[PDB]
Structure formats: C-alpha cells, structure tokens
Amino acid sequence: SAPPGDPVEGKHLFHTICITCHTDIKGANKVGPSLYGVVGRHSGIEPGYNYSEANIKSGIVWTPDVLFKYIEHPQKIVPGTKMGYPGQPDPQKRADIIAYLETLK
Numbered sequence: 332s333a334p335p336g337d338p339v340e341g342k343h344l345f346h347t348i349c350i351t352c353h354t355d356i357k358g359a360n361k362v363g364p365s366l367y368g369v370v371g372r373h374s375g376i377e378p379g380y381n382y383s384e385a386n387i388k389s390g391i392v393w394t395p396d397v398l399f400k401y402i403e404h405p406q407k408i409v410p411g412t413k414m415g416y417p418g419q420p421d422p423q424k425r426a427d428i429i430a431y432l433e434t435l436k
C-alpha cells in the first residue's frame with residue numbers, strides 16, 4: 332500500500348476538496364460517485380452513477396497505491412476521465428486523504 336497518513340486531517344482535506352464533487356456517504360452520488368467504500372473497489376461499479384467510457388473500460392481497482400498516483404494526476408492514471416481535479420501535488424495530503432478513505436468501510 333501507500334505512504335502513512337492521518338485520517339483526521341484526511342477528513343479535513345476530503346471535506347474541503349473532494350466534497351465539492353463527491354460524498355463520503357454510501358450510495359449517494361453527486362457530480363462524482365460516492366467515495367464511501369472506494370478503497371479496494373473496482374472502478375466504474377457504483378450503482379446508478381454515470382461513469383465515463385474511460386473509467387469503465389480502465390480495469391482499475393482502487394488500491395491505496397493506485398489512488399496515491401491517481402489523486403496526483405488523474406489523467407495519467409485514467410486517461411480521458413471526466414474527473415476535473417488538476418491533482419494534488421502534496422504527497423502528504425494525498426496520504427492523509429487516502430488514510431481517511433480507508434475508514435469508509
């Protein structure tokens with residue numbers, strides 16, 4: 332898995348960044364699919380969410396290692412994705428965010 336993070340601060344970053352397009356609640360989809368239970372989940376499977384062609388076809392499984400790269404440069408990991416976030420350059424913010432994602436299960 333990815334570098335060690337802080338879920339408390341991760342919640343803070345989730346709710347100041349991710350929350351603009353996603354939710355941390357199960358099954359509740361907005362502009363983006365719910366991130367509840369995302370860790371370990373296969374891409375494009377959140378019920379009722381309208382995924383892009385790229386995401387569905389990806390064949391990605393959201394492990395910590397992958398989420399770490401993706402959050403940094405989404406287009407590099409899912410070329411053609413419709414997730415508009417330029418990316419998170421701070422590696423510690425990415426580890427904290429993932430740390431928080433991990434509790435959502």
Ligand code: HEM
Nearest residue numbers: 348349352362363364374375382383386412413414415416
């Ligand atoms: C916050 C820093 C943040 C995270 C974390 C995040 C994650 C994420 C994942 C893991 C996916 C794929 C999940 C799956 O396959 O089910 C995904 C997808 C979308 N996102 Fe995202 N995302 C974060 C931030 C943001 C922000 C700020 C926006 C909106 C400006 C956004 C949007 C989207 C969209 C749309 C998708 C679906 C992509 C597609 O089908 O191509 N995310 N995000």
